[PDB]
Amino acid sequence: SELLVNTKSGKVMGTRVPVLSSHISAFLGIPFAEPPVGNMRFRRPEPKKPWSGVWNASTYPNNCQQYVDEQFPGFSGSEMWNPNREMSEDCLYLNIWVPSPRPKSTTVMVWIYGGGFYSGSSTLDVYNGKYLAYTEEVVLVSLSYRVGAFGFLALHGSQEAPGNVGLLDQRMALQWVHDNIQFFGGDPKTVTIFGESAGGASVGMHILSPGSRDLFRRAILQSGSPNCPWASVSVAEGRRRAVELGRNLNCNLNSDEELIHCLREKKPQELIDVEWNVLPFDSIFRFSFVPVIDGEFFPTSLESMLNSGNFKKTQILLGVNKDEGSFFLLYGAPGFSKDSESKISREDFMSGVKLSVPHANDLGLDAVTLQYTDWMDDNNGIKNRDGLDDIVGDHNVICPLMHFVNKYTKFGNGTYLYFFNHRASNLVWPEWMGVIHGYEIEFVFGLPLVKELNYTAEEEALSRRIMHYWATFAKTGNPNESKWPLFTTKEQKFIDLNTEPMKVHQRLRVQMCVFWNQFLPKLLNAT
Amino acid sequence: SELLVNTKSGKVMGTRVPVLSSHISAFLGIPFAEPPVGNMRFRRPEPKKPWSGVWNASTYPNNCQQYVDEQFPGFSGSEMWNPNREMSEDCLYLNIWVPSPRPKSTTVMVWIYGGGFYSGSSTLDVYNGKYLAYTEEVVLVSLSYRVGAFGFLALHGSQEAPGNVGLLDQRMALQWVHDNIQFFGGDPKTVTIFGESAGGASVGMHILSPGSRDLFRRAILQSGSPNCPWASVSVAEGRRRAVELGRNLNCNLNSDEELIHCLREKKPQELIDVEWNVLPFDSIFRFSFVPVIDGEFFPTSLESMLNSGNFKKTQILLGVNKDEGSFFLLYGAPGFSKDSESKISREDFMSGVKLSVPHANDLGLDAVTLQYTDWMDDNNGIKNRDGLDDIVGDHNVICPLMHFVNKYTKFGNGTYLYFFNHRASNLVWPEWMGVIHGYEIEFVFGLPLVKELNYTAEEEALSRRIMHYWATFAKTGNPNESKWPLFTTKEQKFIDLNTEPMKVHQRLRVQMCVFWNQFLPKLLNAT
Ligand SMILES: CC[N+](C)(C)c1cccc(O)c1
Numbered sequence A, B: 001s002e003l004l005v006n007t008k009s010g011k012v013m014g015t016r017v018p019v020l021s022s023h024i025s026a027f028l029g030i031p032f033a034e035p036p037v038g039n040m041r042f043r044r045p046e047p048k049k050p051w052s053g054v055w056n057a058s059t060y061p062n063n064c065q066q067y068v069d070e071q072f073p074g075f076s077g078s079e080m081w082n083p084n085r086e087m088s089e090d091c092l093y094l095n096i097w098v099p100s101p102r103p104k105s106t107t108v109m110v111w112i113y114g115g116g117f118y119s120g121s122s123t124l125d126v127y128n129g130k131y132l133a134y135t136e137e138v139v140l141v142s143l144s145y146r147v148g149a150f151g152f153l154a155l156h157g158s159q160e161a162p163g164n165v166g167l168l169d170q171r172m173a174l175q176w177v178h179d180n181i182q183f184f185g186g187d188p189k190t191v192t193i194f195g196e197s198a199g200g201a202s203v204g205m206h207i208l209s210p211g212s213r214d215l216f217r218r219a220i221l222q223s224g225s226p227n228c229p230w231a232s233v234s235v236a237e238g239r240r241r242a243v244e245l246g247r248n249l250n251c252n253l254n255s256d257e258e259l260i261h262c263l264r265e266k267k268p269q270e271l272i273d274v275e276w277n278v279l280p281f282d283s284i285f286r287f288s289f290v291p292v293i294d295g296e297f298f299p300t301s302l303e304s305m306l307n308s309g310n311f312k313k314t315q316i317l318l319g320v321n322k323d324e325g326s327f328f329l330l331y332g333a334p335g336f337s338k339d340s341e342s343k344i345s346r347e348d349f350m351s352g353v354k355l356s357v358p359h360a361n362d363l364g365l366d367a368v369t370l371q372y373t374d375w376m377d378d379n380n381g382i383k384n385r386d387g388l389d390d391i392v393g394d395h396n397v398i399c400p401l402m403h404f405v406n407k408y409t410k411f412g413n414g415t416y417l418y419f420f421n422h423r424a425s426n427l428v429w430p431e432w433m434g435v436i437h438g439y440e441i442e443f444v445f446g447l448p449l450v451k452e453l454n455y456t457a458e459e460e461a462l463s464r465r466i467m468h469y470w471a472t473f474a475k476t477g478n479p480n481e482s483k484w485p486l487f488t489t490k491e492q493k494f495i496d497l498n499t500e501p502m503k504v505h506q507r508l509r510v511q512m513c514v515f516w517n518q519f520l521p522k523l524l525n526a527t
């Protein structure tokens, strides 16, 4: 049967799922590793020991333990990212969508979810890969990885809590995908890994890490990149933060071993409850447990790896959303309210800039303000609001990203850059947040095709355009079959991704990113 | 007779000069001090000992020794500022234009010429006050002061070369004007001193210096202010520079006395020939001998005097020209040519920024470039040219000026601000220099009235508008009799001075001046 697949790990019994007016095969909850429960907590992922009999892949697996967003109870706009399944340390599973009839050797797409590394689930409705698989005839895989302390606690030097295990979970699923995707009709030599924000940053990290380059062909980075200010921390900082977490749970802090045994004995929720109290600054767009520059997964500093072309050379497709910042301001910046226009005063604005650049000194904060302030209307509430959004966005997502493309393109084999600036008609978030972080996902996953979701006609088109772009690029290394220009260091071409007839632009936010990528860094170094 | 005037200094025989289709009285070359020749060189100005018999004031006096501009031989646009008379250390004279019939007690206007303190003459044709006097029925006085080493050499602590003597020459003429203007029909209690660039900066210095406040009523500052980066130097710098000048002439440098005797024995031209070799940096818009913050003429630092309201409180009328920088770039910046479009490359642009901010460090130079560069078209020759012009202008004239108005208005009694941005139709300078430094003078002195000068009809109007504004403000402390708004710290209103129907704007170049007045200063201090 089309639902019974044999794999090097065991037999898998999938399920037939309905798509639009047809069907596809669905293999959900396939284990790719040993449950990271018990003294395995914080440990590197273990390979799933093969099984006997058919594994039932007809229902989504559990979700990884993680901070749940209770900020707006019942508000779909926020709950849609919350885990829709029971949480559990036993969460290392992957899901595959397979076209019906099963392909003999088609292109594979692996999705790596986002969540600032502290959250994420492969089972969210927005990550339902049935539409992409059906529409673009691609084998769509969605993996899961330990998030929060569970996946990134880093007691560097220890083997019980090495750090980056969440990064290893991803890799192992990539390995599982490499090793068994042929049995699902997928071509293991044409596997494209794509992700958003933390997933988008993860992708580039696999591009960078030597132990991961050989396991995938092409990559798609959405609103995230390896060098994002919040995507990593030094071994020391990770240590610092690991200890602090221990401190918060009344743990013996005399040795890694005492510390780690302690943390291993505390309930998942116990680590989560105090997870944000370890950050080093009052700040926004900063997450507690993230990848560490350990010298293992990452041979060295990301910048030198970038600088010396020490990374897998291939084709990459990446982009950013118009308003990357809003989301984070509405959640931790004063003056912002989900239900108000959020006109921001200068006192509040200047507070926002302090939360945005936590590492900046007074001069740095002053340089940022000078640059993002209209001194001819410095008391405008709208201009201050928007100014804050651009700051959170440029510094955390768009500028870090432009640095990575510019550096990548130098040695890479084809760069394609998009700028998503279309606000879904049915968006439930206040208008002032604009084209919000993570709201390109639904277009990439072809949600606009399901009419009972009420998208506009041109949004359906947009979704098919992006889905094709995404699927066609994965298949060939080029989004084109009206041509989306190749990104080059000289011309710096890039395009818009909206319901209007695509347009080609140059030098994405140069002014602001020169400041963020070259000037500020220098200033703060000098001072 | 209307030409014979008795004064507390002696009888003066003037001359009748023709204006438009009528006449006026002219008293030119009246001595206000003892010739600063001999061992008097560098010494403070001495009062003119009274004379017997009638003094012949029918021909302009000599001009003060000074660097002559030979950059464009025969080019009127530059020679028009050159001395049109024989130069001589015997140059402390003043000129008065008196309406015919002589007024009984009318408003007096004293003009203090510009020239970056190294040049200037009261006898230039552009400074011919017959038009203003006739048209506005005002007693127009034009003084002269020692310029260059002769007027500003500063061996602070010495009495032979105290420094600022050029500033004292001005004062003494002001005193002479105070003491004898009544005999010419001028009201000594309604004397307005106005000047351009160095004269405009001089004016504000007399506003500041305690020993000068009582000698005038109102002030008009054109394209210059006391705190201009080039208007003053510390006693040390002046000393440093005085010695260096001595070094250049093979002078005993063992004592002020040996040094000064040496300099006193060298010919005027000898000091001039080496006058520019003492500057401390490769730079533009920097002059060798300028006022020194000596603690005598200036009680203390200009900023604290500004900060504590330690200055004469009255009404002031000041402004700037659209393109203050061009002139200085065309003369010392690479890439600029009087006869070319002057499209500037980035290599040349970056050289310009180095010459513009000589005291800036690498970070400072980088902050300036970031701010004045269009990184979306950083290779534009026109944009680089213009960018350089704005830099030389904002930092040397417009921003220093905005700081002085903002500080002044705080304790002042009426501020009126103009922005001259009209390029005379008959301008002989290349179009790219735009509305050039010092080209408002001719409008203020009503040159556009003499048809054989070929101005347009609306330029004639402009000139009468400004002349009235200038004369009406001096008479009443208000330019208005369509109303030129009063400058206030809150609103920051100011107007345009061009052939088009005046318009009111706010916050003159805020963006750029916040950077220049607040950010940069801080940056360079921090680093
Ligand atoms: C904005 C919603 N989404 C789940 C994508 C999310 C949440 C936290 C951090 C992120 O970078 C992104």
Ligand SMILES: CC[N+](C)(C)c1cccc(O)c1
Pocket: B081, B114, B115, B116, B196, B197, B198, B327, B437, B438
């Ligand atoms: C630009 C011509 N003018 C004589 C007014 C002049 C010359 C030198 C320095 C100045 O600030 C102004």
